[PDB]
UniProtKB/Swiss-Prot annotation:
UniProt keyword Calcium present: yes
Every Peptidase S1 domain range: 1-221
Family affiliation: Belongs to the peptidase S1 family.
Enzyme category, top tier: hydrolase
S-S bridge residues: C7-C137, C25-C41, C109-C210, C116-C183, C148-C162, C173-C197
Protein name: Serine protease 1
EC number: 3.4.21.4
Amino acid sequence: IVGGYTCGANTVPYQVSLNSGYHFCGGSLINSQWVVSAAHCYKSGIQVRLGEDNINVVEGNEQFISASKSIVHPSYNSNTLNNDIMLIKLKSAASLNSRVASISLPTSCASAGTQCLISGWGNTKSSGTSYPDVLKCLKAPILSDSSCKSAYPGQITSNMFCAGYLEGGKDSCQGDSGGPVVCSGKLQGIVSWGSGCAQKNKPGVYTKVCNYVSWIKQTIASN
Ligand SMILES: [Ca+2]
Ligand SMILES: [Mg+2]
Ligand SMILES: [Zn+2]
């Protein structure tokens, strides 16, 4: 996350870190047994770490649970990143508490202008590489589709939306992929892609979760 702040230990209780020997992506806990992340974060051998603040220090509030199965969306296109969403089931149910809570799925889609909270342990430099060990947060608004599409001509689909600042300066970055974009108490997006980080007129692009609620609900109930 570039131009963001340190969230605070366990202030984004639904935030998860996907680990395969090291942190490689973020995710969101939707209930005691399931996590939603981005399909381009699919790996074999995932351990989910909940209650994390510093990913390099076990401070007492963590739960490290291995995944039993992963389901990438049926229509995921790794070339265009369309339908970039995946569900991960936990081998054991997590214990929800103050530090580990699930986030609600949306009932409707959010409007341009809505302020959201984006979080993750990704790179914090646009021009440079600095990986933080504690969770970073960023408040950013949803941009109108017209400004999202002008920035990425022929690349945005109905399953994506942009959020951020066209002036640049603030944005999600690599290492944040799969993480949450929460607006008005609902999970509205998943960190998917962007052009470099925090560049002017290059906002980040997010998977539009309101379009997959039925798929999520049906898939988790049958697995
Ligand atoms: Ca820790
Ligand atoms: Mg981006
Ligand atoms: Zn990525």
